[PDB]
Design a protein around this ligand. Structure first.
Ligand code: HEM
Ligand code: HEM
Ligand SMILES: Cc1cc(N)nc(C[C@H]2CNC[C@H]2NCCNCc2ccc(Cl)cc2)c1
Ligand SMILES: Cc1cc(N)nc(C[C@H]2CNC[C@H]2NCCNCc2ccc(Cl)cc2)c1
Ligand SMILES: C[C@H](O)[C@H](O)[C@H]1CNc2nc(N)[nH]c(=O)c2N1
Ligand SMILES: C[C@H](O)[C@H](O)[C@H]1CNc2nc(N)[nH]c(=O)c2N1
Ligand SMILES: [Zn+2]
Lengths: 409, 411
């Protein structure tokens, strides 16, 4: 009932009760833990309980739980749902809802920033060009000439499921992937397929190693349209090492804006299938995963050569040595060009502080250890020694099927 | 039911049916995952079914399920239970049992070696001195002058719970930790409390930075007794770096034999409270955890200074740079002194093949991702990208409470 989590490096013990308010399933059972598995229309009967849950916590958050205002709103939404088989959120509810889905994202280490989120209400949007306009404005606002600011743009909610707004890209800004004859892959292997769905739709791929993909926007359920983000709005960073000059010769660069566009935001039962959100990078996401994952730019071997490491034996830890350098470069480059970025040491220390605040202000903090611990130097970061409880709270961000696997053209 | 796990690096998908034989609980529910939580006498009634399940597993393994030998063994065991409230395992069953507890240890990345285990049967042991003799023999055999061999020694099982055999040390070999009045710690902070118990019991502490702790052995539920492991039997490796000549000057060394001695071995319902087992180290256990944990030796700063790294800001990744060098030094040394050791790349790569083979020949391989993934360079090892299922099968190795917290002293 009242679970406890301990930090084994500092012996601090926190008590969690927030989990009791949890409603969604985890995938785990008393017989099997699925903790490491990546991926473990509504009715009026289904919707009202959800809306009620949401409103009560919202009114509770503003110290007006069980007030005429509260009571009144419940009734208004109640009448609206029975009548309209759905409802619309008050601006304040939308903002509160979005901030909280972030607050509840158990896989996000950057949640100490949860309450500082710019919300762009794009619910009056109606077309792909309109979506394009809102997205450019979001990108420009968030980039802020390198001094990044968190934001989310929220398009119209789901209705009959046949009029869904969707951004086909996984992130607003990513590089294209091309499968050459050499069997090899040009650019980012992760995007090969999407890259082709663009071509298949018209895009004139420049076939480069770092080609900024075009946005593929879908509005009201119609077919998706392509748009090239003003190059001037996409801040990029040339990757150079602060000691190895030959580094710049690797020809590496990465974009400054991390911005997830394929998730679904759920607030009080309502579904928002197009809600791109952005913050700023933690160094390892690029240096460790984008650059060194074997299924991504997989650059270790090459960086290894350039360093003249004894790649003969794994026990010389050449892969590890090179990993560190590649990551030192990233932070170095972003910092030099003055684009906001955080290292895994600072981000994890921040998250620990956030957990403590959350435990003593909200009764806990859902967190997914498997995702929170950085992909390098795990145990020298504090989160490694921190026990965490993972459970699902709403409002939330959820994954959803790629549109190209559901679109009735 | 069937469950699938996918490797996001290779797209290889596996199907698990073995989890269907999972009995114990995990700590998780449909509402909460306790996957990162460190730690989430029997009745004839409950014992009967446990022996049966075990015996069925054992006879199936030797291709004699349902045989007369199998049926006689079941009758013999059940008769013994109703008769004495317990039962004794045949040598063969003990060996099979021990090998399987290792095979089922979901937090162990070295399981590819499971079927290769020397089992020493010490169930005829009656005293602390007897325990000491058995342990010295295990240490010498397992050490094998640096060519490490996996081994386990099994002392008498629990009876009424008032006569337990227990090895008070958490590991047969570990360094003493001492709390100074100024608040600093000399030696290994992890063993301060145990080191105090040793001193209280009569140990004469040399008070150094790497003093091998004495063994504190409890036989038949009696008060524990102290014993010093013959020095010539304790293999140690001085740590030095292949290119950094000042590394040897840090004065670091570590023992070669990792041997857990505080866990409980459960086989067919029987409980073996004293069952020390040892293998060989994976580099990071020493280089990352014992050396760099803030609560252990914590040598990152001193090493970073020497390398003259920019320690003014964490974004220089000075901690990460020093960590790599320290781990290179550990591997280099061990390999130079010809003491068995495996690096985390090699070990995780082997575990993945072991895991795949297990899914194919056994229908599964319970594994705890939180523990399998190395404490450094996580994503550049194949296990990071491997989905895993964690569940509990018996036989098994379990945690038990520290003895100094439950023991009834006699005097
Ligand atoms: C301000 C800087 C931020 C930092 C440094 C940060 C950092 C991170 C990191 C390291 C991850 C893991 C990414 C991965 O492994 O794919 C992550 C995941 C995530 N973040 Fe944050 N984050 C930030 C802002 C945001 C914002 C503004 C939101 C949304 C409003 C958010 C929502 C999420 C979600 C839902 C996930 C998990 C998504 C998934 O499962 O793929 N984050 N974040
Ligand atoms: C052959 C060399 C072996 C290697 C390289 C290996 C490696 C490891 C490592 C890296 C861990 C995690 C240690 C930690 O973080 O505390 C571990 C845990 C474990 N290993 Fe192995 N192991 C080996 C042999 C064995 C043997 C022979 C047994 C038993 C017969 C065994 C039983 C276990 C158990 C029970 C755990 C988890 C203990 C706990 O939860 O504290 N291992 N092993
Ligand atoms: C707002 C924000 C801020 C920061 N710093 N980081 C992010 C994360 C985002 C940039 N780096 C990795 C991307 N996430 C990929 C999720 N893959 C899960 C996944 C989902 C589905 C499949 Cl099939 C595979 C994998 C978002
Ligand atoms: C047979 C074998 C072979 C290898 N390679 N490694 C080991 C593991 C052993 C040497 N390095 C760390 C030690 N394990 C301590 C685990 N403590 C967890 C823990 C358990 C309980 C609490 Cl309260 C805290 C922490 C055993
Ligand atoms: C199989 C395993 O769950 C998978 O590789 C996870 C591990 N932890 C992760 N953690 C983060 N932050 N991001 C990821 O993509 C992953 N991948
Ligand atoms: C809180 C968290 O579960 C704890 O720090 C775990 C994480 N993973 C680990 N993994 C291994 N191999 N050994 C450990 O001691 C730990 N500690
Ligand atoms: Zn779980």
């Amino acid at each position: 009932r009242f679970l406890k989590v301990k930090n084994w490096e500092t012996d601090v013990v926190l008590t969690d009760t927030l989990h009791l308010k949890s409603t969604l399933e985890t995938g785990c059972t008393e017989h099997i833990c699925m903790g490491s598995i990546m991926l473990p229309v509504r009715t009026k009967d289904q919707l009202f309980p959800l809306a009620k849950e949401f409103l009560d916590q919202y009114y509770s958050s503003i110290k007006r739980f069980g007030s005429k205002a509260h009571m009144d709103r419940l009734e208004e939404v109640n009448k609206e749902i029975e009548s309209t088989s759905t409802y619309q959120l008050k601006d304040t509810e939308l903002i509160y809802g979005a901030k909280h889905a972030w607050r509840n994202a158990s896989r996000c280490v950057g949640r100490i920033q949860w309450s500082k989120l710019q919300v762009f209400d794009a619910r009056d949007c109606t077309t792909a060009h309109g979506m394009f306009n809102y997205i450019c404005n979001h990108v420009k606002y968030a980039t802020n000439k390198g001094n990044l600011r968190s934001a989310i743009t929220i398009f119209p909610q789901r209705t009959d499921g046949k009029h869904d707004f969707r951004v086909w890209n996984s992130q607003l800004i990513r590089y294209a992937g091309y499968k050459q004859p050499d069997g090899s892959t040009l650019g980012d292997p992760a995007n090969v397929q999407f890259t082709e769905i663009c071509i298949q739709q018209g895009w004139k791929a420049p076939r480069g190693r770092f080609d900024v993909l075009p946005l593929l926007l879908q509005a009201n359920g119609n077919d998706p349209e392509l748009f090239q983000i003003p190059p001037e709005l996409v801040l990029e960073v040339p990757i150079r090492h602060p000691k190895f000059d030959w580094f710049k010769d690797l020809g590496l660069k990465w974009y400054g804006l991390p911005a997830v566009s394929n998730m679904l935001l759920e607030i009080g039962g309502l579904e928002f299938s197009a809600c791109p959100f952005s913050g700023w990078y933690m160094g390892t996401e690029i240096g460790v995963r984008d650059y060194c994952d074997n299924s991504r730019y997989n650059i270790l071997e090459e960086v290894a050569k350039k360093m003249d490491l004894d790649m003969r034996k794994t026990s010389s830890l050449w892969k590890d040595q090179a990993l560190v350098e590649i990551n030192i470069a990233v932070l170095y480059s972003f910092q030099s060009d003055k684009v906001t970025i955080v290292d895994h040491h600072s981000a994890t220390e921040s998250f620990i502080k956030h957990m403590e605040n959350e435990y003593r202000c909200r009764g806990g903090c859902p967190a997914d250890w498997v995702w929170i611990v950085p992909p390098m130097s795990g145990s020298i970061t504090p989160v490694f020694h921190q026990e965490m409880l993972n459970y699902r709270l709403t409002p939330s961000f959820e994954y959803q099927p790629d549109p190209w696997n559901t679109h009735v053209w």
